[PDB]
Amino acid sequence: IKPATMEFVSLSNGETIAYQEVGRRNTDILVLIHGNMTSSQHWDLVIEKLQDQYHIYALDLRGFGQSTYNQSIDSLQDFAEDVKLFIDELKLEKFSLMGWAMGGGVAMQFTANHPTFVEKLILVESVGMKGYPIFKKDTNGQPIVSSLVKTKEEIAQDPVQIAPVLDAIKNMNKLYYRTVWNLLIYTHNQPEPDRYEKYLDDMLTQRNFVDVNYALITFNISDEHNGVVGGSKQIHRIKAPTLVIQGDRDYVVPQVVGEELAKHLPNAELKVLEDCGHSPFIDCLDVFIKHVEDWLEQ
């Protein structure tokens, strides 16, 4: 149930990034970016399927997994800049890039900012181009959908979405995370028990939950205001061939989100996965891997 053995690289901004590196004798490089509540350990199933063919780097973003969190982040662009410093340290010149959920936002932001490095981009249940808002909660714990959270301080005060996660982290409460993930992600299929335990241990390594939520409500690469922040228009700079993967029953990132990404990206194809939620790795790995291999090999 232990995590994978990790490598470490210190960046010029004073962080130390932990990362898995496998398939070191393959030629084509693939870089993997996890999402919220996870580190690179959640890529294990994809790493097992792809490492016989790809040189894979799967990193723990700052404040996740075994990476440091010496300075806080406040935007997904901060994560993208770490990835830039990372690949600079490792002399990577050309790679394919795949991001999951919040990691798709990071991957989009990286690709818009560093076009000469990204051959292919794959977005897996990515956050949308106007981010992911948080609402105030009523007395039943339900969103008040005309009352938007806009600051880090409000996020810290949320008693349903945020505070129980922080308490679970401080109390090593795995049962909390199991209940949440079973309700919203593992609704039809669960990882195998040993793998799920590793995943739950992985969730407890997060040290930046409030900051990441703030970065998500202010993420906006569209042409329009999202109700919180103006849009950077940078989605128009994502010229890499992009595959947008979207599950048909993703309860965290609904299908309309992937459809809008494929509409607004310059060079994108959309594949909606049948009988698939927020984790294609658990719901339909072999179909997912087939799509990824076809994209990368094109």
Nearest CA to 205 out of 106, 21, 63 is that of 63
Residue matched to tokens 């990368």 = 296
Terminal Cα distance for the chain, rounded: 36
- Which residues share a beta bridge with 8? 18
Residue 292 has a CB neighbour count (10 Å cut-off) of: 23
Q: After which residues is the chain broken (C to N over 2.5 A)?
A: none
Cβ-contact 199, 42 below 8 angstroms: yes
Which helix or strand (DSSP H or E) is residue 238 part of?
none
Burial of 298: CB neighbours in 10 Å, binned 0-12, 13-18, 19+: exposed
**What residue ranges do the domains of the chain occupy?**
7-297
Q: Find tokens 């490792």 and name the residue.
A: 90
Q: Contacts by 108-112 with C-beta closer than 8 Å and gap 24+?
A: 108/221, 108/235, 108/238, 109/76, 109/77, 109/79, 109/80, 109/219, 109/221, 109/234, 110/80, 110/83, 110/84, 111/238, 111/240, 111/242, 112/221, 112/234, 112/235, 112/237, 112/238
Beta bridge partners of 289: none
Among residues 211, 219, 195, the alpha carbon closest in space to that of 281 is found at 195
Written as six digits, the tokens of 263 are 């509409």
- Token reading at 7: 């490598």
Judge contact between 1 and 193, C-beta under 8 A.
no
Q: What determination technique applies here?
A: X-ray
Helices (H) and strands (E) in the chain, counts: 11, 10
Angstrom CA distances, 296 to 72, 171, 172, 263, 291, stand at 34, 41, 39, 21, 9
Identify each DSSP E strand in the chain by its residue range: 7-10, 16-22, 29-33, 55-59, 95-100, 118-124, 135-137, 143-148, 242-247, 268-273
At CA 215, angle to CA 97 and CA 8, rounded to 5? 50
| Domain 7-297: CATH class, spelled out | alpha beta
